[PDB]
From a paper:
Metallo-β-lactamases (MBLs) can efficiently catalyze the hydrolysis of all classes of β-lactam antibiotics except monobactams. Subclass B1 and B3 MBLs are dizinc ion enzymes, whereas B2 MBLs employ one zinc ion. The B1 MBLs are the most important from a clinical perspective and include the IMP (imipenemase), NDM (New Delhi MBL), and VIM (Verona integron-encoded MBL) MBL subfamilies. We report on the synthesis and mechanism of inhibition of N-sulfamoylpyrrole-2-carboxylates (NSPCs) which are potent inhibitors of clinically relevant B1 subclass MBLs, including NDM-1.
We investigated the NSPC ligand–enzyme interaction by crystallography and obtained a structure for VIM-1 complexed with 6 (space group: P121 1, 1.21 Å resolution). The two zinc ions (coordinated by H114, H116, D118 (Zn1), H179, C198, and H240(Zn2)) were refined with occupancies of 0.75 for both Zn1 and Zn2. Crystallography reveals that the N-sulfamoyl NH2 group displaces the dizinc bridging hydroxide/water of the B1 MBLs. The NH2- of sulfamoyl group of 6 replaces this “hydrolytic” water, probably in its deprotonated form, though this cannot be discerned from the crystal structure. Comparison of the Zn(1)–Zn(2) distances in the VIM-1:Zn2:6 and the VIM-2:Zn2:CB2 complex reveals differences. Binding of 6, however, does not substantially increase the Zn(1)–Zn(2) distance, i.e. it is 3.60 Å compared to the unligated VIM-1/VIM-2. The structural studies presented here define an NSPC binding mode very similar to that of the α-carboxylate- and N-sulfamoyl-substituted furans and pyrroles as MBL inhibitors described by Wachino et al. Thus, the likely deprotonated amino group of the tetrahedral sulfamoyl group bridges the two zinc ions replacing the hydrolytic water in a manner reflecting a tetrahedral intermediate in catalysis. The structural analyses suggest that the relatively low activity against VIM-1/VIM-2 may in part reflect differences in inhibitor (and substrate) carboxylate binding mode. Comparison of crystal structures of an NSPC and taniborbactam (VRNX-5133), presently in Phase III clinical trials, shows similar binding modes for the NSPC and the cyclic boronate ring systems.
Residue numbers in the entry: 31 to 139, 141 to 262
Write the structure that this text describes.
């Protein structure tokens, strides 16, 4: 019943968590640079189809994700959006494409190709300036500006007031800015402020890693990033 945690998910299975009517998170774990981390994505019901937000961090995990979706939901995943270029977002795109899923990301998310990561097939125009938003099936995609990465997108589910922050939003227990290798710590608080202004009615906020909460995850993120930079 509780939100599943890193030591509760062996690397290779995937759990789903019901967030709201027609909205689930997916939780997987993966090893990176010798430590194991949980990671979140989103599933949003799209009539009799599903929209997937982010892979489950790797080919095997993403295959397991599709299997878990078939077991627990039983509707086909037809489209996926990756919210930035790192492997916890695009690793598994090749598995999705071979399972009939049309894969999408912004043109900026060029970064996957340059890094040697898997590359979504279709480009999402209309998201190149901070504050841009586009509709994509049952969600709104929002580019808040550089934060965790320069390309990071946010996803809002208006039917349920669910804000999926991806890696630009940290969980409340976070004490650090996470993997900052590709981050912009100077702009990150400004980007979070843009999210706060755009989605004041969000009821659930889902971080890229860790436990969902409410709107406080946004301010908390700004605080831990400012403190990391300052420190
Ligand atoms: N998206 S990513 O760069 O590949 N990634 C992988 C692991 C982590 C991570 C998260 C929390 C933490 F406390 C430590 C690490 C991240 C992240 O910061 O988004
Ligand atoms: Zn990342
Ligand atoms: Zn991440």
């Amino acid at each position: 019943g509780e939100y599943p945690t890193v030591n509760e998910i062996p690397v290779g299975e995937v759990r789903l968590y019901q967030i709201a009517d027609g909205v689930w998170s997916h939780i997987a774990t993966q090893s990176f640079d010798g430590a194991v981390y949980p990671s979140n994505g989103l599933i949003v019901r799209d009539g009799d189809e599903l929209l997937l937000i982010d892979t489950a961090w790797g080919a095997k995990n993403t295959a397991a994700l599709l299997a878990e979706i078939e077991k627990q939901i039983g509707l086909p995943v037809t489209r996926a959006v990756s919210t930035h270029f790192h492997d916890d977002r695009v690793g598994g795109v090749d598995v999705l494409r071979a399972a009939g899923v049309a894969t999408y990301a912004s043109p900026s998310t060029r970064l996957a190709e340059a890094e040697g990561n898997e590359i979504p097939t279709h480009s999402l125009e209309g998201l190149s300036s901070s504050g841009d938003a586009v509709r994509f099936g049952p969600v709104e995609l929002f580019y808040p500006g550089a934060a965790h990465s320069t390309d990071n997108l946010v996803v809002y589910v208006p039917s349920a007031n669910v804000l999926y922050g991806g890696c630009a939003v940290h969980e409340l227990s976070s004490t650090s800015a996470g993997n900052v290798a590709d981050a912009d710590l100077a702009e990150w608080p400004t980007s979070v402020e843009r999210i706060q202004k755009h989605y004041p009615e969000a009821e659930v906020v889902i971080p890229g890693h860790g436990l969902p909460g409410g709107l406080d995850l946004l301010q908390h993120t700004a605080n831990v990033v400012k403190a990391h930079k300052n420190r």
